[PDB]
Design a protein around this nucleic acid. Structure first.
Ligand SMILES: [Mg+2]
Ligand SMILES: [Mg+2]
Ligand SMILES: [Mg+2]
Ligand SMILES: [Mg+2]
Ligand SMILES: [Mg+2]
Ligand SMILES: [Mg+2]
Ligand SMILES: [Mg+2]
Ligand SMILES: [Mg+2]
Ligand SMILES: [Mg+2]
Ligand SMILES: [Mg+2]
Ligand SMILES: [Mg+2]
Ligand SMILES: [Mg+2]
Ligand SMILES: [Mg+2]
Ligand SMILES: [Mg+2]
Ligand SMILES: [Mg+2]
Ligand SMILES: [Mg+2]
Ligand SMILES: [Mg+2]
Ligand SMILES: [Mg+2]
Ligand SMILES: [Mg+2]
Lengths: 216, 218
RNA sequence: AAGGUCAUUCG
RNA sequence: AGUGGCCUUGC
RNA sequence: AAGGUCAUUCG
RNA sequence: AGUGGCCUUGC
């Protein structure tokens, strides 16, 4: 029920249809779904995060803050924030069709919905977002839970040492086409490592993470 | 002179150093420059533009609104909006060092500066931005004064017709290394065209535009 | 529609 | 962030 | 720093 | 949006 979500959010909607739209997947309704709210929500939440980063590190450069932002505005991090709202239990979509992509999109749409319902009060919405997640975000940073970009880190290591970039190649692919599992190999000089994932990029990130350790 | 910019903006700063920072390039000052404000400004202005798009097309999908956003938050469009502020005349950087990149960065930083100076009043800053640029943005959209993405349009034409994508290759490069001019060739099936630019991508965009015309005329 | 893949554009 | 071609699955 | 180039990550 | 290697130029 919507009331339970409003209680978790700490905000009561004037237009309940706005909240319903944010929670509804297009496959469930072609008239009122979250796609447009998600578009707005992405820009709104990205702004909330960037502002928080700059506020607590006013004298830090873009090279320090952007890597943090890159993870904090990611679908993965939004799924972690969404857990606090048990968002998955309010999404209107066929049973068993919910995945991280959907949860991440609804999270963004939900915030656009609050923003619009509040009369487009950006200040209000930003502070409500912080009331709920500011400490979680800052703590994730301080406690080292921000994920590293292993593919980039790896090529910086190899480019500094050998002025060369690592190479990745597919070793194997298995499972149904809509649920493939990839195994790739990362290599630099005579060092080689393996990585697995649901996409080639994910498998490469895993292999890079291992190759870095090996080089050390 | 800052007062002249404040007059154009319709906003008077409480902390003049914030405005100065937004107008100063790092090569001019390594202590107080616009780099961090630019980082914040990009996110702030992007939000202003996306909100405006959704507000005037609440029932339009992301596939319709994002292509518009892609142009409206681009450095190119920001340079056009900046002209209204004669922004180039207020930037603190060595004479003759100003270019489109700098102007676009200062534009974003300037808005982050207003946002911060106003006590982080996003609502107020959003409306100040609209007071100055809302009509300019909506008119650009309605009139079709939005840069077309020729490379993407071209591959959609070729993929629909032949389920194939065009190919690009470098034909020649000349001029100083810091001021190169590229000539590239775009091709699909037996159709080929040339394009030139200051970067390979720019040359490819021009070659793609010519190829789209060649296909339509065929 | 969801997963993957190739490609392209914008930030 | 958007889009197009291709494979798979879903209806 | 500014231009270009190759590559990589995030939206 | 960030970053790294390379070429050029600027101080
Ligand atoms: Mg309340
Ligand atoms: Mg969407
Ligand atoms: Mg997003
Ligand atoms: Mg999104
Ligand atoms: Mg998403
Ligand atoms: Mg790949
Ligand atoms: Mg910058
Ligand atoms: Mg920008
Ligand atoms: Mg910028
Ligand atoms: Mg810029
Ligand atoms: Mg080429
Ligand atoms: Mg290229
Ligand atoms: Mg897909
Ligand atoms: Mg890009
Ligand atoms: Mg997307
Ligand atoms: Mg450069
Ligand atoms: Mg990407
Ligand atoms: Mg940049
Ligand atoms: Mg030198």
């Amino acid at each position: 029920m919507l009331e339970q979500l409003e209680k978790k959010l700490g905000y009561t909607f004037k237009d309940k249809s706005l909240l319903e739209k944010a929670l509804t997947h297009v496959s469930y309704s072609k008239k009122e779904h979250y796609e447009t709210l998600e578009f707005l929500g992405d820009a709104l939440v990205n702004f909330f995060i960037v502002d928080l980063l700059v506020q607590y590190s006013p004298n830090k450069r873009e090279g320090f803050l952007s890597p943090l932002k890159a993870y904090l505005i990611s679908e993965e991090f939004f799924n972690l924030l969404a857990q606090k709202l048990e968002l998955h239990k309010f999404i209107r979509i066929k049973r068993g069709k919910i995945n991280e992509t959907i949860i991440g999109d609804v999270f963004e749409a939900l915030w656009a919905a609050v923003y619009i319902d509040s009369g487009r009060d950006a200040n209000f919405t930003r502070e409500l977002f912080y009331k709920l997640f500011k400490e979680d975000i800052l703590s994730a940073i301080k406690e080292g839970r921000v994920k590293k970009d292993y593919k980039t880190i790896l090529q910086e290591i190899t480019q500094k040492r050998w002025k060369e970039r690592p190479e990745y190649r597919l070793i194997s692919v298995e499972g149904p086409h809509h649920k493939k599992k990839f195994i790739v190999e990362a290599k630099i000089k005579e060092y080689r490592t393996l990585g697995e994932g649901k996409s080639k990029k994910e498998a490469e990130q895993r292999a890079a993470e291992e190759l870095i350790k090996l080089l050390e």
